[PDB]
Amino acid sequence: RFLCGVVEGFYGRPWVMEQRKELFRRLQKWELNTYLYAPKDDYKHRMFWREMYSVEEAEQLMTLISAAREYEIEFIYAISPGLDITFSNPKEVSTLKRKLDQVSQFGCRSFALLFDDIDHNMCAADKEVFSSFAHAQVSITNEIYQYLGEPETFLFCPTEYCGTFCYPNVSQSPYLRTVGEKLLPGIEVLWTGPKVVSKEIPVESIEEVSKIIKRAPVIWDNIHANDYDQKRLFLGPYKGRSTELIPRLKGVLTNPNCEFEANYVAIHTLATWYKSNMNGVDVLYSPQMALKLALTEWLQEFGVPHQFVPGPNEKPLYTAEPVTLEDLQLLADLFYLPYEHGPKGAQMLREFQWLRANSSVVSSEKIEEWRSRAAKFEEMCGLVMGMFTRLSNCANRTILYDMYSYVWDIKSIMSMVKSFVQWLGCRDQEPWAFRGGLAGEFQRLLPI
Amino acid sequence: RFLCGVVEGFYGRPWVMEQRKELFRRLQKWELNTYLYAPKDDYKHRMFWREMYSVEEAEQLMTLISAAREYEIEFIYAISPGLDITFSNPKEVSTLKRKLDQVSQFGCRSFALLFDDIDHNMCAADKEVFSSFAHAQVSITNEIYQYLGEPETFLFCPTEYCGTFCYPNVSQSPYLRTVGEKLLPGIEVLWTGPKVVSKEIPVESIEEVSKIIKRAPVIWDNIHANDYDQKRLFLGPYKGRSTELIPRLKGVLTNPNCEFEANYVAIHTLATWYKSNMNDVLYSPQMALKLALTEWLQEFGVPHQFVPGPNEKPLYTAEPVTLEDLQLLADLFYLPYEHGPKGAQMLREFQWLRANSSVVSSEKIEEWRSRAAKFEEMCGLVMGMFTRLSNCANRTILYDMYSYVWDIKSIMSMVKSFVQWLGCLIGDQEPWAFRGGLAGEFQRLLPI
Ligand SMILES: CNC(=O)C[C@@H]1[C@H](O)[C@H](O)[C@@H](CO)N1CCCc1cccc(C(F)(F)F)c1
Ligand SMILES: CNC(=O)C[C@@H]1[C@H](O)[C@H](O)[C@@H](CO)N1CCCc1cccc(C(F)(F)F)c1
């Protein structure tokens, strides 16, 4: 019994109810089974975790939970009390119980307590009752778990939730040792890999952590998360996790891009990865082949919402060409993965670096190498503009709007790069010449 | 009788109906009077300008237009056919007429044709009928204007809509000469100033253009527009346009930030500017900023107990957003050509600390250490500002701004960390160490 699906676990604008219901439909379509509710900035999840839902909010969560059951998706309600809970005040424990039991009255049977992204310092009153921060967390987690009747799925996100967050390392951490020893065995533990955003999650890294927590973890995967950098988006395939992990894990829940419609590839390729070795103990999963599968399917959504035919001498329709598979392949390569651009992106960057570095050669056989390489690069910059133009004319406006900022940025920068290469081949600005804000001026003075 | 208010004239996710109705309420509250509907990417405004609204869309626009009349705001319906229109095909002219009279059946009496951001090249069939691009535009604009019964308010956005777009200059442009001579005198002309995003709009610049278009223009002001750069936001005051312009103009319509709630200052300060010389000693941008910010503050504590003892964990959520937080925020995201005083101050202090950092390893040491600690205090104010914003009751305002405030606090946190390191950073890093994506790698190779 493996929990595979999506955690809405990110910072910023959460997903709205309509989007979550649509998520459930996609999860089911792709034979995934789990959703973990945890939006960092949905006010009653974390900041105001004490506050009960209103009659309005109650009705909406009930409707959502019913939608999950209807789509055969396990609904997991997480709460994040760690910013300000006095762990040793039993009214505080009661308040936490009240909150979770209100949600259980909405039909929810699966739960989670999360202690990610809080500092390790307890108040004086908690230091006198518990000998460490982990003891304090494990005590209320155990007490809540049993208060709810030992539900079949209950998750715990540790504060040391990845290799690099473990002081002094994974295998000797007194925080994780305590979690492994004291956290009740029915409770599952979340883990993001060697890092917050793990490039790879090697099998031996999971053998290491499994030993100290004394269970196989559930992965909380940040591979496609994009809340940490305003300019980033990830449309590359699920990658860097061997299918051999599946037998050594209780699940994988991916925490993907903030922009809902940008997660077609992220979730589709996750599903393809899970399905490839669902009952494992000869290569089963190819990230490229999976990207192509995801993109081919995604394409069909662009021509669906969410005449005049001009003669030979007349102005041809601006709107005539639909988005192509090749446009989406290019787009994904430009906004690929946190540690890697896709082949076409890396190729354009390499060609531009070369054209810039050999540009003195204008002013030999080397000139026609430069001019032919430049014209081929301009062709590629043209494909980026073409991709933007056809996206901006697509019938699915909802997908367009989620992606707009990103595609506009890349096309806009490729247009400056193209223009710059043309200028190299020929020997009071608007504000978009000088980009990034104040933020960007600070950033440019830091080491890169 | 002066048109002052807002044009929704930008690229990307348009505003939804609820937000537009809320705009009308604010415009009225601040004694502004005009809204110009022109979202570049609302599909039936520009790309698919030929397509009639559905029953659903019709009902929504009717409701919106009624809301405008109810709030004493003139509603102006713009359409942008320039990407695609064969100007000489009378079916095309008929299609345009059909579209506009559908909108007039929704209750709308004011209209606009826009030819901004299209190229100057006509199809063969239009070249045989019209001797220039301006003749073609002026011909259908005049024909539509009279077909609608010469409505009291009808606007025209030229293709050469600012000083720098005029070939070869404003006073000798054969495009604008033709517009001035041939465009019917009842029709108003839109103008963005010397530039697309005009730092200043000098009086003599408007005297220059007024002479050649043969009327006073309506300014389409892009001062606070932020669609051109994904990282930018503008919360500084309306600035750089003398109150002496008002007698020489038919109006000012501001095209502000994409994020609806970020436009409290942009629109409020515009209103204060207009009201100051309705019929520069009269308008102070700083005093106006302060007025706007003080008023805006009241919105943060309104949606759209437990008391811990001396030894217990204090509430994370206790401190509300302050006026000083919003003053700091505005100074960090101020104006397209200028940061606010606190922003410029932090940048200056960081440049100094970086450039004199060798001094660690004299009186100069204690100058460095005292300046550094004072800079860390200021970086802490940025984090404080973020944390208190993220706890505010108006979630709608928070979410519109989230990306920006998160970015600035995130970068100030790296800058703070970097100054601390200088007073005492790579290896296997998380992705947010290296910011900006593919786009950012291209940008860093362009000249700065
Ligand atoms: C399992 N729990 C987590 O991974 C916690 C969080 C969120 O879930 C988030 O979606 C995900 C990926 O971003 N995590 C980032 C943590 C590092 C961080 C914190 C604050 C600020 C930054 C920043 F400096 F990068 F902005 C990073
Ligand atoms: C009166 N009409 C206008 O001003 C037209 C547009 C939109 O209204 C937009 O909201 C405003 C400010 O951005 N204008 C920018 C024009 C320059 C441009 C065009 C394409 C792309 C770019 C970019 F690459 F820089 F982003 C700029």
Short mmCIF file of N, CA and C in Angstrom, two decimals, chain A residues 11-14 41 43 47-48 50-51 83-84 86 89 92 121 123-125 164 195-197 227-232 308 313-319 334 339 341 345 348-349 352 356 392-393 397 401-402 404-406 408-409 413-414 417 420 428-432 435-436 438-439 441-443 445 447, chain B residues 11-14 41 43 47-48 50 84 86 89 92 121 123-125 164 195-197 227-232 305-306 311-317 332 337 339 343 346-347 350 354 390-391 395 399-400 402-404 406-407 411-412 415 418 428-432 435-439 441-443 445 447:
data_model
loop_
_atom_site.label_atom_id
_atom_site.label_comp_id
_atom_site.label_asym_id
_atom_site.label_seq_id
_atom_site.Cartn_x
_atom_site.Cartn_y
_atom_site.Cartn_z
N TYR A 11 4.65 27.64 -0.64
CA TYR A 11 4.43 29.00 -0.16
C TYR A 11 3.73 29.83 -1.26
N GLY A 12 2.87 30.76 -0.86
CA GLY A 12 2.19 31.65 -1.75
C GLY A 12 0.72 31.33 -1.92
N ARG A 13 0.15 31.87 -3.00
CA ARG A 13 -1.25 31.67 -3.35
C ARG A 13 -1.57 30.19 -3.41
N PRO A 14 -2.39 29.69 -2.49
CA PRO A 14 -2.81 28.31 -2.64
C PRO A 14 -3.72 28.08 -3.85
N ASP A 41 0.51 28.96 3.21
CA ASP A 41 -0.12 30.25 3.43
C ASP A 41 -1.64 30.26 3.34
N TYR A 43 -4.44 30.41 5.43
CA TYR A 43 -4.28 30.91 6.79
C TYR A 43 -4.58 29.97 7.98
N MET A 47 -0.51 29.50 9.98
CA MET A 47 -0.41 30.74 10.77
C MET A 47 -1.44 30.79 11.90
N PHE A 48 -2.70 30.58 11.53
CA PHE A 48 -3.83 30.57 12.45
C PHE A 48 -4.38 29.14 12.54
N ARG A 50 -4.90 27.43 15.06
CA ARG A 50 -5.83 27.27 16.19
C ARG A 50 -7.28 27.49 15.81
N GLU A 51 -7.52 28.27 14.76
CA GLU A 51 -8.87 28.76 14.46
C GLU A 51 -9.62 27.67 13.72
N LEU A 83 5.07 26.97 14.63
CA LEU A 83 5.57 28.35 14.74
C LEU A 83 5.36 28.91 16.11
N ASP A 84 4.27 28.47 16.74
CA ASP A 84 3.83 29.10 18.00
C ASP A 84 3.09 28.22 19.05
N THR A 86 2.71 26.03 22.22
CA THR A 86 3.37 25.65 23.47
C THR A 86 3.02 24.19 23.68
N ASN A 89 1.46 22.92 27.05
CA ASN A 89 0.18 23.45 27.57
C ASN A 89 -0.94 22.52 27.07
N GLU A 92 -3.48 23.87 24.61
CA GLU A 92 -2.91 23.92 23.30
C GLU A 92 -3.03 22.59 22.59
N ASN A 121 14.24 26.16 18.55
CA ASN A 121 14.20 26.70 19.92
C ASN A 121 12.84 26.68 20.59
N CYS A 123 10.28 27.42 23.93
CA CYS A 123 10.05 28.31 25.05
C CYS A 123 10.46 27.66 26.38
N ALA A 124 10.64 28.47 27.42
CA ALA A 124 11.08 27.98 28.73
C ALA A 124 10.19 26.85 29.25
N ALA A 125 8.87 27.02 29.12
CA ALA A 125 7.90 26.07 29.67
C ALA A 125 7.99 24.69 29.03
N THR A 164 20.76 17.43 4.43
CA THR A 164 21.47 18.65 4.85
C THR A 164 20.92 19.34 6.10
N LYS A 195 18.61 16.66 0.08
CA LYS A 195 18.46 18.12 0.12
C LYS A 195 17.00 18.49 0.12
N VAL A 196 16.73 19.77 0.32
CA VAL A 196 15.38 20.29 0.12
C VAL A 196 14.89 19.98 -1.30
N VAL A 197 15.67 20.40 -2.28
CA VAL A 197 15.39 20.11 -3.68
C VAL A 197 16.47 19.15 -4.13
N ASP A 227 8.36 27.84 -5.72
CA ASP A 227 8.09 28.99 -4.83
C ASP A 227 9.34 29.73 -4.41
N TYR A 228 10.47 29.06 -4.48
CA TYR A 228 11.74 29.67 -4.02
C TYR A 228 12.40 30.71 -4.94
N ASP A 229 11.93 30.83 -6.17
CA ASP A 229 12.55 31.77 -7.13
C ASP A 229 11.47 32.17 -8.14
N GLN A 230 11.10 33.43 -8.07
CA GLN A 230 9.99 34.04 -8.79
C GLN A 230 10.07 33.78 -10.27
N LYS A 231 11.29 33.73 -10.85
CA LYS A 231 11.41 33.53 -12.28
C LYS A 231 11.35 32.09 -12.77
N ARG A 232 11.31 31.10 -11.87
CA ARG A 232 11.45 29.68 -12.28
C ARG A 232 10.16 28.92 -12.43
N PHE A 308 -14.19 34.08 -40.99
CA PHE A 308 -13.57 34.85 -42.08
C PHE A 308 -12.28 34.15 -42.56
N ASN A 313 -4.25 38.21 -51.51
CA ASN A 313 -3.68 39.55 -51.29
C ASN A 313 -4.00 40.21 -49.93
N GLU A 314 -4.75 39.53 -49.06
CA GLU A 314 -5.25 40.14 -47.82
C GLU A 314 -4.42 39.74 -46.61
N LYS A 315 -4.67 40.45 -45.51
CA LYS A 315 -3.93 40.25 -44.28
C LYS A 315 -4.28 38.86 -43.68
N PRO A 316 -3.27 37.95 -43.61
CA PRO A 316 -3.54 36.59 -43.12
C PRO A 316 -3.82 36.61 -41.63
N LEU A 317 -4.61 35.64 -41.18
CA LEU A 317 -5.04 35.62 -39.80
C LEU A 317 -3.84 35.44 -38.89
N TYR A 318 -3.80 36.25 -37.82
CA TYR A 318 -2.71 36.23 -36.82
C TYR A 318 -2.77 34.98 -35.94
N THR A 319 -3.96 34.39 -35.93
CA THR A 319 -4.50 33.49 -34.95
C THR A 319 -4.55 32.04 -35.50
N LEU A 334 13.13 24.96 -22.05
CA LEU A 334 13.50 26.31 -21.51
C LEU A 334 13.22 26.47 -20.01
N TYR A 339 18.11 21.58 -11.58
CA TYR A 339 19.56 21.53 -11.77
C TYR A 339 20.02 21.36 -13.23
N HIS A 341 18.86 22.43 -17.59
CA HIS A 341 17.98 22.89 -18.67
C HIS A 341 17.82 21.74 -19.65
N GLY A 345 17.36 24.27 -24.67
CA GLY A 345 17.76 25.41 -23.86
C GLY A 345 19.27 25.50 -23.69
N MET A 348 20.94 26.56 -26.98
CA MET A 348 20.86 28.00 -27.28
C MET A 348 21.85 28.79 -26.43
N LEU A 349 21.93 28.46 -25.15
CA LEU A 349 22.88 29.13 -24.26
C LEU A 349 24.32 28.94 -24.71
N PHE A 352 24.99 30.96 -27.90
CA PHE A 352 25.13 32.38 -27.60
C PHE A 352 26.46 32.71 -26.93
N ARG A 356 29.10 35.27 -28.57
CA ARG A 356 29.60 36.42 -27.82
C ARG A 356 31.13 36.37 -27.73
N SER A 392 -0.17 32.33 -27.00
CA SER A 392 -1.03 33.46 -26.67
C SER A 392 -2.37 33.48 -27.45
N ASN A 393 -2.47 32.66 -28.50
CA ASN A 393 -3.67 32.51 -29.31
C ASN A 393 -4.48 31.24 -29.01
N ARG A 397 -7.47 29.45 -22.12
CA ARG A 397 -7.00 30.71 -21.56
C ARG A 397 -6.48 30.50 -20.15
N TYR A 401 -2.90 31.75 -18.98
CA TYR A 401 -2.68 32.74 -17.91
C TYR A 401 -1.69 32.23 -16.81
N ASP A 402 -1.74 30.96 -16.50
CA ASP A 402 -0.86 30.41 -15.49
C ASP A 402 0.60 30.50 -15.96
N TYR A 404 1.76 32.65 -18.39
CA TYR A 404 2.02 33.83 -19.16
C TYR A 404 3.31 34.50 -18.79
N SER A 405 3.48 34.79 -17.52
CA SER A 405 4.67 35.52 -17.05
C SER A 405 5.99 34.89 -17.50
N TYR A 406 6.02 33.56 -17.50
CA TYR A 406 7.20 32.81 -17.79
C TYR A 406 7.51 32.86 -19.29
N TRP A 408 6.31 34.94 -21.47
CA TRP A 408 6.59 36.32 -21.83
C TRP A 408 8.01 36.71 -21.48
N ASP A 409 8.49 36.29 -20.32
CA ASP A 409 9.84 36.62 -19.91
C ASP A 409 10.88 36.02 -20.87
N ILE A 413 13.42 38.07 -23.33
CA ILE A 413 14.85 37.99 -23.21
C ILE A 413 15.48 37.41 -24.47
N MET A 414 14.90 36.38 -25.07
CA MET A 414 15.43 35.91 -26.35
C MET A 414 15.40 36.96 -27.45
N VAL A 417 18.45 39.07 -26.78
CA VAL A 417 19.62 38.28 -27.15
C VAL A 417 19.79 38.22 -28.68
N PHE A 420 20.84 41.52 -29.88
CA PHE A 420 22.26 41.69 -29.54
C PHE A 420 23.20 40.95 -30.50
N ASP A 428 19.18 56.64 -23.45
CA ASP A 428 17.87 56.86 -22.84
C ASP A 428 16.93 55.68 -23.17
N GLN A 429 17.07 54.62 -22.39
CA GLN A 429 16.35 53.35 -22.60
C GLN A 429 15.01 53.30 -21.88
N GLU A 430 14.14 52.40 -22.34
CA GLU A 430 12.91 52.04 -21.63
C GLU A 430 13.31 51.14 -20.45
N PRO A 431 12.45 51.01 -19.42
CA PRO A 431 12.91 50.32 -18.19
C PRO A 431 13.24 48.84 -18.35
N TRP A 432 12.53 48.17 -19.25
CA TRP A 432 12.80 46.77 -19.58
C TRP A 432 14.16 46.44 -20.23
N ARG A 435 16.79 45.00 -16.36
CA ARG A 435 15.75 44.12 -15.78
C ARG A 435 16.04 43.64 -14.38
N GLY A 436 15.00 43.15 -13.71
CA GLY A 436 15.03 42.81 -12.27
C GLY A 436 14.80 44.13 -11.55
N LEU A 438 15.09 46.50 -7.80
CA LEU A 438 16.02 46.61 -6.71
C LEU A 438 16.61 45.26 -6.37
N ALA A 439 15.75 44.24 -6.28
CA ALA A 439 16.21 42.88 -6.01
C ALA A 439 17.35 42.47 -6.90
N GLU A 441 19.44 44.43 -8.58
CA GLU A 441 20.64 45.21 -8.31
C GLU A 441 21.44 44.62 -7.14
N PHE A 442 20.76 44.18 -6.09
CA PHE A 442 21.40 43.43 -5.01
C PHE A 442 21.98 42.11 -5.47
N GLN A 443 21.21 41.39 -6.25
CA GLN A 443 21.62 40.07 -6.71
C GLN A 443 22.93 40.09 -7.51
N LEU A 445 25.47 42.05 -7.30
CA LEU A 445 26.64 42.29 -6.44
C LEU A 445 27.03 41.09 -5.56
N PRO A 447 28.26 37.12 -5.12
CA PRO A 447 28.99 36.15 -5.96
C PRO A 447 28.06 35.13 -6.64
N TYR B 11 -0.62 43.48 -20.67
CA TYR B 11 -0.45 42.11 -21.15
C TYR B 11 -0.56 41.14 -19.98
N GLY B 12 -1.11 39.95 -20.24
CA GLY B 12 -1.21 38.90 -19.25
C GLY B 12 -2.62 38.69 -18.74
N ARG B 13 -2.71 38.04 -17.57
CA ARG B 13 -3.98 37.71 -16.92
C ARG B 13 -4.78 38.99 -16.73
N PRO B 14 -5.89 39.13 -17.42
CA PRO B 14 -6.72 40.28 -17.12
C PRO B 14 -7.37 40.24 -15.74
N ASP B 41 -4.77 40.65 -23.57
CA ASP B 41 -4.94 39.21 -23.70
C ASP B 41 -6.29 38.65 -23.31
N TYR B 43 -9.26 37.46 -24.73
CA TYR B 43 -9.24 37.01 -26.11
C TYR B 43 -10.10 37.74 -27.15
N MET B 47 -6.99 39.54 -30.04
CA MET B 47 -6.66 38.38 -30.88
C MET B 47 -7.84 37.93 -31.71
N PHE B 48 -8.97 37.69 -31.04
CA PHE B 48 -10.22 37.26 -31.67
C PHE B 48 -11.26 38.40 -31.60
N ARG B 50 -12.90 39.70 -33.87
CA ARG B 50 -14.03 39.44 -34.76
C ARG B 50 -15.19 38.72 -34.06
N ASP B 84 -4.51 41.90 -37.55
CA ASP B 84 -5.17 40.99 -38.44
C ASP B 84 -6.18 41.55 -39.49
N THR B 86 -7.98 43.33 -42.45
CA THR B 86 -7.82 43.86 -43.80
C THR B 86 -8.72 45.09 -43.85
N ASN B 89 -11.36 45.58 -46.74
CA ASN B 89 -12.43 44.62 -46.99
C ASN B 89 -13.67 45.09 -46.23
N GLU B 92 -14.99 43.05 -43.32
CA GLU B 92 -14.16 43.24 -42.16
C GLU B 92 -14.60 44.48 -41.38
N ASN B 121 3.23 47.39 -41.54
CA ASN B 121 3.04 46.79 -42.86
C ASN B 121 1.63 46.34 -43.18
N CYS B 123 -1.17 44.63 -45.88
CA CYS B 123 -1.29 43.65 -46.96
C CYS B 123 -1.44 44.34 -48.32
N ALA B 124 -1.22 43.59 -49.41
CA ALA B 124 -1.27 44.14 -50.76
C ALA B 124 -2.59 44.85 -51.04
N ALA B 125 -3.71 44.24 -50.63
CA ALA B 125 -5.05 44.79 -50.94
C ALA B 125 -5.30 46.12 -50.25
N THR B 164 9.28 58.52 -28.87
CA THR B 164 10.27 57.62 -29.48
C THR B 164 9.73 56.72 -30.61
N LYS B 195 8.01 58.64 -24.09
CA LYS B 195 8.38 57.23 -24.16
C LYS B 195 7.18 56.37 -23.85
N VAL B 196 7.35 55.06 -24.03
CA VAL B 196 6.35 54.11 -23.58
C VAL B 196 6.10 54.28 -22.08
N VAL B 197 7.18 54.20 -21.31
CA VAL B 197 7.14 54.43 -19.88
C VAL B 197 7.87 55.73 -19.64
N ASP B 227 3.97 44.84 -16.59
CA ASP B 227 3.93 43.63 -17.43
C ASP B 227 5.23 43.36 -18.17
N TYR B 228 6.04 44.39 -18.35
CA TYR B 228 7.29 44.26 -19.11
C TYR B 228 8.47 43.56 -18.39
N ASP B 229 8.36 43.33 -17.09
CA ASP B 229 9.43 42.71 -16.33
C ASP B 229 8.83 41.99 -15.13
N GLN B 230 8.89 40.67 -15.19
CA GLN B 230 8.27 39.74 -14.24
C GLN B 230 8.61 40.06 -12.81
N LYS B 231 9.83 40.55 -12.54
CA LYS B 231 10.21 40.86 -11.15
C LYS B 231 9.73 42.19 -10.59
N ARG B 232 9.15 43.07 -11.41
CA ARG B 232 8.87 44.47 -11.00
C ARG B 232 7.47 44.74 -10.56
N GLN B 305 -9.87 34.32 22.33
CA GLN B 305 -8.56 34.06 21.75
C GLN B 305 -7.60 33.42 22.77
N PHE B 306 -6.38 33.12 22.33
CA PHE B 306 -5.32 32.57 23.20
C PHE B 306 -4.27 33.65 23.52
N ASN B 311 6.40 32.73 30.32
CA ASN B 311 7.29 31.60 29.97
C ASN B 311 6.93 30.82 28.69
N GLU B 312 5.83 31.17 28.02
CA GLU B 312 5.31 30.37 26.91
C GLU B 312 5.69 30.94 25.56
N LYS B 313 5.44 30.14 24.53
CA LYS B 313 5.77 30.50 23.17
C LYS B 313 4.86 31.65 22.71
N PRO B 314 5.46 32.84 22.41
CA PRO B 314 4.65 34.00 22.03
C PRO B 314 4.06 33.80 20.65
N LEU B 315 2.91 34.42 20.42
CA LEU B 315 2.20 34.20 19.18
C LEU B 315 3.04 34.77 18.03
N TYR B 316 3.10 33.99 16.95
CA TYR B 316 3.81 34.34 15.71
C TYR B 316 3.09 35.44 14.95
N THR B 317 1.79 35.56 15.25
CA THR B 317 0.81 36.28 14.47
C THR B 317 0.40 37.60 15.13
N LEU B 332 10.99 49.86 -1.68
CA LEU B 332 11.68 48.72 -2.36
C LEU B 332 11.12 48.42 -3.77
N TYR B 337 11.93 54.35 -12.89
CA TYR B 337 13.27 54.93 -13.01
C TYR B 337 13.95 55.30 -11.69
N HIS B 339 14.26 54.09 -7.21
CA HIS B 339 13.88 53.39 -5.98
C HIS B 339 13.55 54.44 -4.94
N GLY B 343 15.18 52.10 -0.06
CA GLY B 343 15.77 51.16 -1.01
C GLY B 343 17.13 51.61 -1.50
N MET B 346 19.75 51.30 1.29
CA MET B 346 20.26 49.95 1.53
C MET B 346 21.25 49.55 0.45
N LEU B 347 20.92 49.85 -0.80
CA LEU B 347 21.81 49.53 -1.92
C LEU B 347 23.15 50.24 -1.80
N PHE B 350 25.18 48.67 1.07
CA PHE B 350 25.72 47.38 0.68
C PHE B 350 26.90 47.52 -0.29
N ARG B 354 30.57 46.09 0.59
CA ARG B 354 31.26 45.16 -0.30
C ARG B 354 32.62 45.74 -0.73
N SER B 390 2.59 38.46 5.82
CA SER B 390 2.12 37.09 5.64
C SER B 390 1.09 36.63 6.72
N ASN B 391 0.96 37.40 7.80
CA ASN B 391 -0.02 37.16 8.86
C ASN B 391 -1.28 38.04 8.78
N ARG B 395 -6.21 38.49 2.83
CA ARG B 395 -5.45 37.46 2.15
C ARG B 395 -5.34 37.78 0.66
N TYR B 399 -1.91 37.80 -1.33
CA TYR B 399 -1.61 36.91 -2.46
C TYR B 399 -1.17 37.66 -3.74
N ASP B 400 -1.74 38.82 -3.98
CA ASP B 400 -1.36 39.60 -5.14
C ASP B 400 0.11 40.05 -5.04
N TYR B 402 2.48 38.55 -3.02
CA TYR B 402 3.31 37.56 -2.36
C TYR B 402 4.65 37.37 -3.05
N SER B 403 4.62 37.12 -4.34
CA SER B 403 5.83 36.85 -5.11
C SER B 403 6.92 37.91 -4.94
N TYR B 404 6.48 39.15 -4.90
CA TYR B 404 7.37 40.29 -4.83
C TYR B 404 7.99 40.42 -3.46
N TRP B 406 8.12 38.13 -1.16
CA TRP B 406 8.93 36.95 -0.92
C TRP B 406 10.28 37.09 -1.60
N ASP B 407 10.30 37.60 -2.82
CA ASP B 407 11.56 37.74 -3.54
C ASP B 407 12.51 38.71 -2.81
N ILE B 411 16.09 37.76 -1.08
CA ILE B 411 17.34 38.33 -1.51
C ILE B 411 17.99 39.14 -0.40
N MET B 412 17.24 39.90 0.38
CA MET B 412 17.84 40.58 1.53
C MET B 412 18.43 39.62 2.56
N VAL B 415 21.80 38.72 1.13
CA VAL B 415 22.67 39.88 1.26
C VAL B 415 23.15 40.05 2.71
N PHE B 418 25.55 37.38 3.46
CA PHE B 418 26.80 37.72 2.79
C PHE B 418 27.62 38.78 3.53
N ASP B 428 27.74 22.33 -2.64
CA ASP B 428 26.58 21.62 -3.21
C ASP B 428 25.30 22.36 -2.75
N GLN B 429 24.95 23.38 -3.52
CA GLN B 429 23.92 24.35 -3.13
C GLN B 429 22.51 23.94 -3.55
N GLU B 430 21.53 24.51 -2.84
CA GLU B 430 20.12 24.40 -3.22
C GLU B 430 19.90 25.35 -4.41
N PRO B 431 18.84 25.16 -5.21
CA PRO B 431 18.72 25.93 -6.46
C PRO B 431 18.56 27.43 -6.30
N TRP B 432 17.90 27.86 -5.23
CA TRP B 432 17.76 29.28 -4.90
C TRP B 432 19.04 30.06 -4.55
N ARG B 435 20.07 32.15 -8.87
CA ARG B 435 18.72 32.59 -9.23
C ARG B 435 18.49 33.00 -10.67
N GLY B 436 17.24 32.83 -11.10
CA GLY B 436 16.74 33.39 -12.35
C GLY B 436 16.48 32.47 -13.53
N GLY B 437 16.86 31.21 -13.47
CA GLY B 437 16.60 30.33 -14.58
C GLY B 437 17.46 30.56 -15.80
N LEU B 438 17.08 29.87 -16.87
CA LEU B 438 17.67 30.04 -18.16
C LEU B 438 17.69 31.51 -18.57
N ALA B 439 16.56 32.16 -18.41
CA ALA B 439 16.44 33.58 -18.71
C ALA B 439 17.53 34.39 -18.08
N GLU B 441 20.50 33.37 -17.00
CA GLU B 441 21.82 33.08 -17.57
C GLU B 441 22.04 33.87 -18.87
N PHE B 442 21.02 33.98 -19.73
CA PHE B 442 21.07 34.86 -20.89
C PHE B 442 21.24 36.33 -20.52
N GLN B 443 20.48 36.76 -19.54
CA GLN B 443 20.48 38.17 -19.13
C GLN B 443 21.85 38.64 -18.65
N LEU B 445 24.79 37.72 -19.56
CA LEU B 445 25.72 37.87 -20.69
C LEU B 445 25.43 39.09 -21.57
N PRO B 447 25.05 43.21 -22.09
CA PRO B 447 25.72 44.33 -21.40
C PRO B 447 24.78 45.08 -20.44
#
